Each structure stands twice: as C-alpha cells, then as structure tokens.
Amino acid sequence: SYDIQAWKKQCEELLNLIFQCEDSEPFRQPVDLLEYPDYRDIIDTPMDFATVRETLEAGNYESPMELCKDVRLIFSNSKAYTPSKRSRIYSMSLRLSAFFEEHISSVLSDYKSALRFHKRN
Ligand SMILES: COc1ccc(NC(=O)N2CCN(C(=O)c3ccoc3)C[C@@H]2C)cc1
C-alpha cells in the first residue's frame, strides 16, 4: 500500500473520531487566555484539536509526523497545567492519548513505508 498522500484523509477521519469522543471536549478550542490569564506563563506553545484540523485542511502539514507532534503537544500542555494524577481533565487527556496513539501507529507506518518504496531504486 504505497500511497504517499493517503495519510491526510486517514488523519481527517481520526480527527472526526476524536471530535465524537466526549473525552475531547476540553481540548477542542484554544484555551481562553482571559479565562486562564496565567496559561501563557506555563504554556510556551498553545495547541488544540481545532487548530490541528485547520492546519491539516490549509495544507500546512507536510507529513503525519508533524500532525502527531502537534497532537502530542495538546497532551503535554494539559499535563503541564493540571494539578493531580487524579484530575478529571488529566483522566480524559490520558484516555484520549491512548486512543490517538492506538490509531496513529498504522498511519505513520504506512506513510514511512510509502516514502521508502518511492526511494527504493
Ligand atoms: C470548572 O470546569 C472546567 C473544567 C475543565 C476546564 N479545562 C481546563 O482546565 N483545561 C486546562 C488544561 N487544558 C489544556 O492545557 C489544553 C487545552 C487544549 O490543549 C491543552 C485543557 C483545558 C482547557 C476548565 C473548566
């Protein structure tokens, strides 16, 4: 399966599944800086799933590795803000991360395989 472009629709479908997860609600939109005025004191690079979807649709990701880095930044940023290992948001961030990682693994493998096939000769 050596389609170099296939990752983009696969990532759009996975973002649709993440939007349907109730566990995504707190990560869907950019954190309101007025609601949390100290957010930018701790978080250097804000990220959320609407920003990831818009970047993808703008044609501003070259590879699924770049999309994966931004999704992993949502989860690291949530971990940097949260106050407990038994925080509600933290419990949701960890379930959503496991779901994301389970599904992105084949997207990354297939992309890297397709690029190796393109370079094979
Ligand atoms: C009183 O009811 C509530 C319950 C939950 C919240 N949400 C939060 O505390 N959050 C801070 C940590 N987050 C993030 O750092 C992040 C957001 C996108 O990517 C990461 C998630 C989210 C915005 C606010 C009020």
From Swiss-Prot:
Q: Locate the Bromo domain: which residues?
A: 2-107
Ranges in coiled-coil conformation? none
- Location(s) in or outside the cell: Nucleus
Sites bearing Phosphothreonine, chain numbering = T45
Q: In which tissues is it expressed?
A: Expressed in myeloma and epidermoid carcinoma cell lines.
Which disorder is recorded? Chung-Jansen syndrome: An autosomal dominant disorder characterized by developmental delay, intellectual disability, autistic features, anxiety, hypotonia, obesity, and dysmorphic features.
Query: Which named protein is this?
Result: PH-interacting protein
Specify the species.
Homo sapiens (Human)
Q: What portion of the full-length protein is represented by this chain?
A: 1315 to 1435 of 1821
